[PDB]
Design a protein that fits this description.
The structure is cut from a larger assembly and holds chains A (about 180 residues), B (about 600 residues), C (about 160 residues), D (about 450 residues) and E (about 130 residues). Chain C is mostly helical. Helices cover about 20% and strands about 0% of the residues of chain C. Chain E is mostly helical and about 130 residues long. The chains are: A mainly alpha (about 180), B mainly alpha (about 600), C mainly alpha (about 160), D mainly alpha (about 450), E mainly alpha (about 130). The complex binds cardiolipin (CDL) (2 copies), the ligand CCCCCCCCCCCCCCCCC[C@@H](O)O[C@H](CO[C@H](O)CCCCCCCCCCCCCCC)COP(=O)(O)OCC[N+](C)(C)C and 1,2-dioleoyl-sn-glycero-3-phosphoethanolamine (PEE) (4 copies). One 1,2-dioleoyl-sn-glycero-3-phosphoethanolamine binds next to helix 7 and helix 9 of chain D. Chain B: One of its GO terms (molecular function) is NADH dehydrogenase (ubiquinone) activity.
């Protein structure tokens, strides 16, 4: 999620992803813990038979018939964690996520309550404001000519600098705002 | 004078006071849910009096209090019907709703908009009470649409979730498909019987034709989620557990069946519609049970069980036993609501975990939920002298001892077996094995709200069947004589299902793994009906709506025909007429030609 | 802030205007493919794959996570049809044809066997129910001034 | 009747002489007072009509339309007061003058005891609307829209005038009362067929008919908020009023000639409801919904039964109010967003809950939820069509299903989901917008208590 | 061996089952690198416009304007009368009208004939 994607997936990444999917779907098939442990160790042994293989064409032939076999026996109703992109509580709390700038439109009678919070917010806004001009310059001087090649942002290199484009990553509402 | 009317209107009237006070100050405090729960409990204990009067005397009423618009010879008025059905269904619904709000007090403890949730629940209850007591078709339609809109609002309670909005729109779509038949029935009844009142409709239809009954059957299939329009009920489990326990399990989803109960004088005079109803109920209950016996989400299993029970109710209606179907509604509300409450308690205890693959040993980890779920499953499958027996046993006997179709009876028996199968599946996969939940145990039941709400419906699910059956007057001829083997058909079928499903489930412990068969894939994917029917038609509609309706005709051809052709023709004629180089020779020659034509043509 | 040249135009026929259009829509020339040049007014708009937005990666950090869309990337012509609230093209564990055949066969078998059961009903070894007063003539329809044919029931 | 016309005329001098910062207040107050005065016309009789004089008369079909027309002006002023803030006093007074002139023309049109006077005012209503659309419009296409909104209308209306004068040469009077009392059957002839067409298509073009509905999306999209309100609420009902007034002399030729228009409306309601499903513009979607509802009204008028007429009147009133509310909500979104696209701004219920409630109520009342008067009119028309032929119920039910689908689609796309991240200029809704929504919605839920007030003369 | 999955329009081919993915080549790698470079440039522009504290408005999305304009305003100028378009327009704009006209006309002639013969039983039919 946080880490920037790569231009492509290597063979080891693909085999690791297949291993993850196969073990998860095997756990979905094998409800009980001991049965899952036995069959997962059996699957690990089946996977590590060809670990030391060197031929790239034969390696590509491998993992492909494995993906086909996985698709044939992929447990059409697999287990999904509640907050996962397929879970029952994937986006339950997205209706309670309110942006930070909404507080700028509060009535003064509402800002009369919670004065310390708005003072700290003022310090945060000043820090963002002073910081922003420098961040743009860093991005301008650090970005390779011809535009970025990978959507990875550099860290702050000086003392008083801050990571470029940090405001909307630091100011996420919450995971469970209410 | 005659307190029956005053009490039976006062219950519904006092059901609406918290809606009035929703704009007051109490709505902004945390005592609002307690206010609503107390109001509902008082409404139930107040409606217990008309039930007592009816049981004593058999007293029935029609209260046509307010006069709405009068349209020539057709008069529309605010009329409430207080027959056996209304005065019996109101207390049960109020009791279930009281239990549901008491449970939601604890289940929605951390929800910021809990007062709005309770207001929505009360509004749904008000709309359902409007639907049940309606004496004319317009008020019944008002309730029909109110319950649907409240279901739409409550399914999409978490509006930040895409799937909740999708499920709400699905439910609205299927209910409008039923609305088509409902409106057809209304139009036919007004055109031919000249009234929407129940009395005039019953009087002027000695032998009811096919079309109004087919419209009523379509509306009932739409609202009760029969086989043709089933998937919206399984998909409605996206809403909060109290919503699934109140609306989509016990009160709202029976409404369509109730409709067919209300028009039973016209139902018995038609044979084709009865056969269609019986076949639809049989196929619905079979298909829903078969889909249920292989699900992993507990809420989905309970919803499919509810749909199977609705199919059984439709079969009972089809075999000319409306009162028995009403009794089944009354018992099913009790035990299915309590079952859903147990499911919600388990769900909350395991940190919002719904799949049964992560639920292990709970027989000792949580005992009260265990005993409540066991009692509910026993009542649902049918244990003699329990609340489910007095209904389902008579259902089976009436099906066996009457002139029906063989296939419908076979599917009813197989559906009973599959009901036992998924009940034992739930119990085995959720209560018997070793624990499989995450290590951080947060199991807790020490809360009086949940315990009291569950135990009230427990006492109901144990005693209410006997009390109600022995209290109401006899409304049909009993099957006093029976073959000894055919007397025990339901019991042996249920026991066989229990034993076979337990034996099949016990083989999961075996250290052997085999790929699934085609039948398992068909049953797990809901007969593949949700895939095809939610991908093939919709696309083929939406694409057309942009290709032919929007672009081809509206944007191109309708534009080409009238405006663009006129513009092109006028531009061409203007260019031709105005393009004169200014040479008087050509104009003078044209004038000479015109003079010659005028001299040679106009004389 | 949008200029005239950054709006869709007619169908591109030469490679130069094809490259210009591909640059306009922020995509490679190789990836660019306009709709076939027929009467319908697609003009020069990329024919993106007909894949739905449900099966886009749900773990990537999209600028619009609900719609699963990025800011400047081209939008499919039928985007409103694929919004995760409508028709989705996600692959299924079983093939489309197999599911179609299974559903159709189940429905057809159910209908045929329901018709068969209608042809062959089930009943008990009993005669019709007997009713006392002229088969309840007076209480079913009425008409007391017609004197229906008297029916007498059997004692056995 | 002059007790309503004269204050509307005095609204002009008052606006011009009003202080440079007090035009809106005076206009709103006096328009509301004039609406209160016009409320008295609802007291109708079961007898003929309220014949005030030789020039103006009232009826229980004209009375609800007149009340709605008088009520719309304060709402139009309240909606227009927002986007005209940076505008010079003379031109704001000109805008108010155009609104007042349109209201005066509509008020005189709805009484119109004589058909030539009715035609004159019915075509005089065109000029202020065209000026409003082509002057105070945002996009460059407004001019084109104006042209369309003009010529279509005239393309239907110029033959009507000829027919009208021809009738006066044969009948001898174009007064509605004499025309009703001295009506004679039309022989099935080619000349009578063409006279029927000349009398009918002028009103069919403004409803609009499915074939002739092209001008409406353009005119509604490019017009300002007040123009959209007046077009959707009142200007579409002129065709229905004219048809109900003029179909008396067209019998019995109406039975044969109604078939093409009945088929066109019954299929175009489905076509426009399906078009609403795939729409990237809020105003266009509302316009197509208006087209569908007016197609249903056309079906009702062509069926020509008492229940048809009652349902038609109720549906016109309800649709006017509902469409005005929907356009107002869309304009409130646009004033913050400046894009007028459904998919751009999302999840507004999180930021503006009360406006989300207003959106929900508007969508529900457009969905024809009972016991709203929308449902009353729809059900009456459906029952009359079923009596006309039992097969219409399929198309009617399909239309209801698609209507519910696109209404909830409009609600969910804009209110539900996750908010757009980069949009930060979404300020809290003002008191003016909320008051506008409340003043739009409360009359509907009050009229559902007294339906007979809007059911027309055949009640 | 196992039964093969057959792709369809509404059930597309899985990502891990595409034969094209396993045919890796330098040209394909370069194409993917260029695609990710384009996406990275667009994302960088969007974030630069997004995190700016001075901005107090929506960020204009030229892709969205292009989509809306091509959907609505670019249809007719690119339209050409073609046998496909002519036939499809004629069908979808004329056929349903005549079909429904025939259906309703047949129904109404049947009803009128039944009324004329008097065998319709219109008792209690008062409201119409
Ligand atoms: C039911 C009995 C009622 C008796 C009490 C009297 C109540 C009078 C209310 C009249 C209508 C309200 C005015 C409309 C604008 C809303 C005002 C507002 O902004 O709320 C701020 C206020 C404060 O909220 P907040 O926390 O500050 O803001 C948070 C957000 O706004 C977030 O907002 P939210 O999430 O809280 O949502 C607001 C809420 C409420 O907002 C609404 O949506 C109101 C919409 C109601 C109807 C929708 C249109 C459909 C057409 C129906 C027309 C019937 C009208 C009858 C005559 C009405 C007279 C004016 O929405 C809903 O709950 C959904 C309602 C859908 C119900 C569908 C069933 C319709 C038919 C029901 C039967 C009616 C006839 C019965 C005949 C047989 C029995 C005798 O909220 C309320 O006041 C809630 C109102 C109470 C609920 C009313 C819903 C049912 C009433 C139906 C009409 C009246 C029936 C008359 C007798 C019935 C017996
Ligand atoms: C007159 C005397 C009366 C007495 C008669 C005799 C008494 C009873 C005799 C017993 C007869 C059979 C009972 C055993 C049932 C089978 C259970 C079993 O072994 O399942 C495992 C086995 C496969 O397991 P798996 O794939 O390895 O799953 C992996 C794990 O187990 C995954 O496990 P999991 O943890 O995920 O979940 C486990 C779950 C998942 O298991 C499943 O996958 C369920 C799927 C099969 C079970 C469903 C059986 C219900 C049959 C209703 C069908 C109605 C007609 C449908 C028409 C379809 C048309 C295509 O299994 C269960 O929980 C229990 C399943 C249901 C068994 C208990 C109730 C059934 C007994 C009642 C049947 C008749 C008695 C009625 C009594 C009334 C007196 C008349 O299932 C089968 O092999 C199928 C056996 C029978 C299926 C028949 C349908 C075949 C349709 C093909 C085409 C046919 C021609 C159509 C032509 C149409 C052309 C137009
Ligand atoms: C484009 C979007 C919609 C715009 C509005 C469209 C609706 C307007 C259509 C007007 C309705 C049809 C016009 C005439 C209908 C009369 C009935 C006729 O069709 O039936 C037969 C008529 O026969 C033939 O139809 C003869 C006429 C054929 C010539 C008409 C051209 C046909 C297609 C042209 C359509 C173009 C219309 C739009 C022009 C701009 C019956 O034969 P007959 O019993 O002997 O005649 C009875 C009438 N009498 C008694 C007066 C003599
Ligand atoms: C409340 C506060 C006051 C409490 C003290 C007063 C107690 C009651 C005494 C009031 C006097 C009785 C009264 O109200 O008069 C009846 C009066 C109408 O007069 P009628 O002549 O009978 O009928 C109209 C035709 N002329 O009835 C009322 O208006 C009050 C009660 C009516 C029912 C309540 C309204 C609830 C339903 C709202 C409408 C719902 C939509 C339409 C219904 C659709 C049904 C198909
Ligand atoms: C007998 C003769 C009948 C004459 C009927 C006249 C119909 C009224 C419309 C006349 C418009 C003719 C002018 C015209 O179209 O010019 C093309 C013109 C080019 O634009 P320009 O601004 O002039 O210049 C741009 C380049 N710098 O195209 C347009 O813009 C037209 C846009 C608006 C079209 C108006 C709508 C007309 C169609 C509506 C129905 C009327 C049809 C006629 C009657 C139908 C038969 C009953
Ligand atoms: C006749 C009706 C014709 C069908 C109308 C098509 C309308 C198309 C526009 C709808 C908008 C698109 C939409 O709703 O999205 C599709 C949406 C999403 O699918 P999910 O399964 O929820 O996926 C969620 C998991 N990711 O699914 C739907 O809701 C669409 C439902 C379409 C159902 C059409 C088939 C119904 C046919 C019923 C016939 C049987 C009737 C029964 C007879 C009873 C007689 C007694
Ligand atoms: C949005 C665009 C819609 C355009 C509306 C056009 C439809 C109206 C019909 C065409 C105009 C006819 C106007 C006639 C006015 C009524 C007068 C009348 O009917 O009197 C007839 C006159 O009837 C006519 O002359 C009509 C002839 C038509 C001439 C103009 C043709 C215009 C185009 C016709 C084809 C289109 C037909 C359908 C158009 C529908 C619109 C799409 C009797 O004549 P007499 O000589 O007095 O009889 C003595 C013997 N008994």
């Amino acid at each position: 999620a946080f880490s920037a994607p790569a231009a492509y997936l290597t063979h080891q990444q693909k085999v690791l992803r297949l291993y993850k999917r196969a073990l998860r779907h095997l756990e979905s098939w094998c409800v009980h813990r001991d049965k899952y442990r036995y069959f997962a160790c059996l699957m690990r042994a089946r996977f590590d038979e060809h670990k030391n293989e060197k031929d790239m064409v034969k390696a590509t032939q491998l993992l492909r018939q494995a993906e086909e076999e996985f698709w044939y026996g992929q447990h059409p109703q697999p287990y999904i964690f509640p907050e996962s992109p397929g879970g029952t509580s994937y986006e339950r709390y997205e209706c309670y996520k309110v942006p930070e700038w909404c507080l700028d439109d509060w009535h003064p009678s509402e800002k009369a309550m919670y004065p310390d919070y708005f003072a700290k917010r003022e310090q945060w806004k000043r820090l963002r404001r002073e910081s922003w001009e420098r961040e743009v310059k860093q991005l301008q001087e650090e970005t390779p000519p011809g535009g970025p090649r990978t959507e990875a942002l550099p860290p702050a290199r000086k003392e008083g600098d801050l990571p470029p484009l940090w405001w909307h990553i630091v100011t996420r509402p919450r995971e469970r705002p209410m | 004078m005659n307190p029956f009317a005053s009490l039976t209107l006062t219950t519904l009237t006092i059901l609406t006071i918290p809606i009035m006070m929703s704009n007051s100050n109490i709505y902004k405090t945390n005592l609002y849910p307690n206010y609503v729960k107390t109001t509902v409990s008082y409404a139930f204990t107040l409606s217990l009096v008309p039930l007592l009067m009816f049981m004593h005397t058999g007293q029935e009423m029609i209260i046509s209090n307010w006069h709405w618009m009068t349209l020539q010879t057709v008069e529309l008025s605010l009329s409430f019907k207080m027959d056996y059905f209304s005065v019996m269904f109101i207390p049960v619904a109020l009791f279930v709703t009281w239990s549901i709000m008491e449970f939601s007090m604890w289940y929605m403890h951390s929800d910021p908009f809990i007062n709005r949730f309770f207001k929505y629940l009360l509004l749904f209850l008000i709309t359902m009470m409007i639907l049940v007591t309606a004496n004319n078709l317009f008020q019944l339609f008002i309730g029909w649409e109110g319950v649907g809109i409240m279901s739409f609002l409550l399914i999409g309670w978490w509006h930040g979730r895409t799937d909740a909005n999708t499920a709400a729109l699905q439910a609205i779509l299927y209910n409008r498909i039923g609305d088509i038949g409902f409106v057809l029935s209304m139009a036919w009844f007004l055109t031919h019987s000249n009234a929407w009142d129940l009395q005039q409709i019953f009087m002027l239809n000695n032998e009811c034709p096919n079309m109004p009954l087919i419209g009523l059957l379509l509306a009932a299939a739409g609202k009760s989620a029969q086989f043709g329009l089933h998937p919206w009920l399984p998909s409605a489990m996206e809403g909060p557990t109290p919503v699934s326990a109140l609306l989509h399990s016990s009160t709202m989803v029976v409404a369509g069946v109730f409709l067919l109960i209300r028009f039973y004088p016209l139902m018995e005079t038609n044979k084709l519609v009865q056969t269609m109803t019986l076949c639809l109920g049989a196929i619905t209950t079979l298909f829903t049970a078969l889909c249920a016996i292989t699900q992993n989400d507990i809420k989905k299993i309970v919803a499919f069980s509810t749909s199977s029970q609705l199919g059984l109710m439709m079969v009972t209606i089809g075999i000319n036993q409306p009162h028995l179907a009403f009794l089944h509604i009354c018992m099913h509300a009790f035990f299915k609501a309590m079952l859903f409450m147990c499911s919600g308690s388990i769900i909350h205890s395991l940190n919002d975990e719904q799949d049964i693959r992560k639920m292990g040993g709970l027989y000792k980890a949580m005992p009260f939920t265990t005993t409540a779920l066991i009692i509910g499953s026993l009542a649902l499958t049918g244990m003699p002298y329990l609340t489910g027996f007095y209904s389902k046993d008579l259902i089976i006997e009436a099906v066996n001892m009457s002139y029906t179709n063989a296939w419908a009876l076979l599917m009813t028996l197989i559906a009973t077996s599959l009901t036992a199968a998924y009940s034992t599946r739930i119990i085995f996969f959720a209560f018997l094995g070793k624990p499989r939940f995450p290590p951080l145990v947060l199991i807790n039941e020490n809360n009086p709200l949940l315990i009291n709400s569950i135990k009230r419906l427990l006492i109901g699910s144990i005693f209410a069947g006997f009390i109600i059956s022995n209290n109401i007057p006899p409304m049909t001829v009993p099957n006093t004589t029976m073959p000894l083997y055919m007397k025990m058909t339901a019991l042996i079928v249920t026991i066989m299902g229990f034993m076979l499903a337990l034996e099949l489930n016990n083989t999961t412990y075996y250290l052997k793994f085999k790929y699934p068969s085609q039948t398992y894939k068909f049953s797990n994917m809901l007969g593949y009906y949700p895939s095809i029917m939610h991908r093939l038609p919709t696309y083929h509609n939406l694409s057309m709506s942009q290709k032919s309706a929007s672009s081809l005709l509206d944007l191109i051809w309708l534009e080409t025909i009238l405006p663009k052709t006129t513009s092109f023709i006028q531009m061409k004629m203007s260019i031709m007429v105005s393009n004169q180089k200014g040479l008087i020779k050509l104009y003078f020659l044209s004038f000479l030609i015109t003079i010659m034509i005028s001299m040679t043509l106009f004389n | 802030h949008v200029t005239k040249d950054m709006f869709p135009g007619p169908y591109p026929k030469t490679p130069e205007e094809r490259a210009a259009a591909a640059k306009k829509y922020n995509m490679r020339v190789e990836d660019y493919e306009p709709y076939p040049d027929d009467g319908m007014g697609y003009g020069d708009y990329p024919k993106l794959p007909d894949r739905s937005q449900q099966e886009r990666d749900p773990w990537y950090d999209w600028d619009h996570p609900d719609l699963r869309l990025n800011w400047g990337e081209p939008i499919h012509w039928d985007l409103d049809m694929y919004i995760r609230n409508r028709v989705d093209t996600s692959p299924t564990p079983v093939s489309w044809n197999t599911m179609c055949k299974h559903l159709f066969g189940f429905v057809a078998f159910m209908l045929f066997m329901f018709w068969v059961g209608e042809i062959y009903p089930s009943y008990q070894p009993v005669g019709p129910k007997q009713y006392p007063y002229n088969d309840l003539y007076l209480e079913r329809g009425g008409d007391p001034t017609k004197e229906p044919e008297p029916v007498v029931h059997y004692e056995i | 009747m002059l007790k309503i016309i004269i204050p509307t005329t005095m609204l002009l001098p008052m606006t011009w002489m009003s202080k440079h910062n007090m035009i809106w207040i005076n206009a709103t107050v006096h328009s509301l007072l004039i609406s209160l005065i016009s409320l008295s016309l609802l007291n109708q009789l079961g007898e003929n009509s309220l014949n005030f004089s030789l020039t103006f008369f009232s009826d229980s079909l004209s009375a609800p339309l007149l009340v709605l027309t008088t009520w719309l002006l304060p709402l139009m002023l309240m909606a227009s007061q927002s986007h005209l803030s940076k505008e010079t006093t003379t031109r704001k007074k000109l805008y108010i003058t155009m609104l007042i002139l349109l209201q005066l023309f509509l008020i005189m049109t709805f009484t119109a005891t004589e058909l030539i006077l009715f035609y004159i005012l019915f075509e005089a209503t065109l000029v202020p609307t065209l000026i409003i659309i082509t002057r105070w419009g945002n996009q460059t296409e407004r001019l084109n829209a104006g042209l369309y909104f003009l010529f279509y209308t005239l393309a239907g209306s110029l033959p009507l005038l000829v027919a009208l004068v021809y009738i006066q040469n044969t009948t001898g009077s174009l007064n509605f009362l004499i025309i009703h009392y001295w009506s004679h059957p039309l022989s099935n002839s080619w000349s009578n067929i063409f006279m029927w067409l000349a009398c009918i298509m002028a009103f069919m073009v403004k409803m609009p008919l499915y074939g002739l509905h092209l001008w409406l999306p353009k005119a509604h999209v490019e017009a300002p908020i007040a123009g959209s309100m007046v077009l959707a609420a009142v200007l579409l009902k002129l065709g229905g009023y004219g048809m109900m007034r003029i179909t008396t002399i067209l019998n019995p030729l109406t039975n044969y000639m109604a078939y093409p228009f009945l088929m066109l409306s019954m299929w175009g309601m489905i076509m426009t409801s399906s078009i609403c499903l795939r729409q990237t513009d809020l105003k266009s979607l509302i316009a197509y919904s208006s087209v569908s509802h007016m197609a249903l009204v056309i079906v009702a008028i062509m069926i020509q039964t008492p229940w048809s007429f009652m349902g038609a009147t109720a549906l016109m009133i309800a649709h006017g109010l509902t469409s005005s509310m929907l356009f107002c909500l869309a304009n409130t979104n646009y004033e913050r967003v400046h894009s007028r696209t459904m998919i751009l701004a999302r999840g507004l219920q999180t930021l503006l809950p009360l406006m989300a409630t207003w959106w929900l109520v508007a969508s529900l009342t457009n969905l024809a939820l009972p016991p709203s008067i929308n449902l009353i009119g729809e059900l009456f028309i459906i029952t009359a069509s079923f009596s006309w032929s039992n097969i219409t119920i399929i198309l009617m039910g399909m239309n209801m299903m698609i209507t519910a689908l696109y209404s909830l689609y409009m609600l969910i796309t804009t209110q539900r989901g996750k908010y757009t991240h980069h949009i930060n200029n979404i300020k809290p809704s003002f008191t003016r917008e909320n008051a506008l929504m409340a003043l739009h919605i409360l009359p509907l839920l009050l009229l559902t208590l007294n339906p007979k007030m809007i059911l027309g003369p055949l009640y | 061996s196992f039964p093969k999955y057959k792709p369809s329009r509404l059930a597309t081919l899985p990502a891990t089952l595409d034969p094209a993915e396993y045919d890796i080549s330098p040209e394909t790698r370069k194409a993917q690198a260029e695609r990710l470079a384009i996406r990275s440039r667009l994302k960088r522009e969007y974030l630069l416009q997004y995190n700016d504290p001075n901005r107090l408005g929506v960020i204009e999305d030229p892709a969205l304007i292009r989509w809306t304009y091509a959907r609505s305003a670019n249809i007719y100028p690119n339209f050409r009368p073609t046998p496909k378009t002519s036939l499809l327009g004629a069908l979808f704009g004329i056929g349903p009208l005549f079909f429904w006209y025939y259906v309703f006309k047949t129904d109404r002639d049947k009803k009128e004939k039944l009324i004329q013969e008097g065998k319709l039983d219109q008792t209690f039919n008062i409201s119409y």
